[PDB]
Amino acid sequence: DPLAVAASIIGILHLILWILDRL
Amino acid sequence: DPLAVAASIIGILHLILWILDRL
Amino acid sequence: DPLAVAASIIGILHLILWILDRL
Amino acid sequence: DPLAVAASIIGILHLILWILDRL
Numbered sequence A, B, C, D: 001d002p003l004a005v006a007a008s009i010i011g012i013l014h015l016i017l018w019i020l021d022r023l
């Protein structure tokens, strides 16, 4: 499922960027 | 699955909106 | 899949809670 | 799907970390 693939990549990137902004 | 579909859309929108708010 | 189900519910909830916190 | 599983775990962790940060 392409939608699931995109959402997974987006969530992983989202958590990383949020951690980097909090740091 | 409607729940997976809605959650994927919402995660994509959540990343978009969060980034725009941080900018 | 209970993990996917819980993650979908939780992602919806996370967007709700973040929008309300920023507002 | 390992990608979906990793992203689900990541989403649960993200809500946990974000809630702890807001509190």
Ligand SMILES: CCCCCCCC/C=C\CCCCCCCC(=O)OC[C@H](O)CO
Pocket: A017, A020, A021, B018, B019, B022, B023
């Ligand atoms: C093609 C995709 C390009 C993406 C758009 C690039 C534009 C960035 C503009 C100004 C940044 C200046 C602010 C310096 C960094 C602080 C904001 C921040 O930390 O955000 C990063 C994270 O993705 C969310 O917070």
Ligand SMILES: CCCCCCCC/C=C\CCCCCCCC(=O)OC[C@H](O)CO
Pocket: C013, C017, C018, C020, C021, D019, D022, D023
């Ligand atoms: C599925 C279950 C969802 C349960 C949802 C829990 C609601 C939070 C409880 C009380 C808010 C306390 C009133 C103070 C208002 C600040 C908002 C707040 O602290 O909520 C936690 C989080 O930071 C986002 O708002």
Ligand SMILES: CCCCCCCC/C=C\CCCCCCCC(=O)OC[C@H](O)CO
Pocket: A022, A023, D013, D017, D018, D020, D021
């Ligand atoms: C899956 C494992 C995750 C491991 C958990 C690591 C927690 C380490 C926290 C601070 C050390 C670095 C200080 C960084 C300060 C940012 C604080 C932060 O991490 O935000 C979330 C936290 O629960 C509220 O702030």
Ligand SMILES: N[C@H]1CCC2(CC1)[C@H]1C[C@@H]3C[C@@H](C[C@H]2C3)C1
Pocket: A004, A007, A008, A011, B003, B004, B005, B007, B008, B011, C003, C004, C005, C007, C008, C010, C011, C012, D004, D005, D007, D008, D011
């Ligand atoms: N925060 C979101 C919640 C929804 C999912 C992406 C991340 C998550 C992982 C996959 C399987 C379901 C639906 C999406 C794809 C649960």
Ligand SMILES: [Cl-]
Pocket: none
């Ligand atoms: Cl935030």
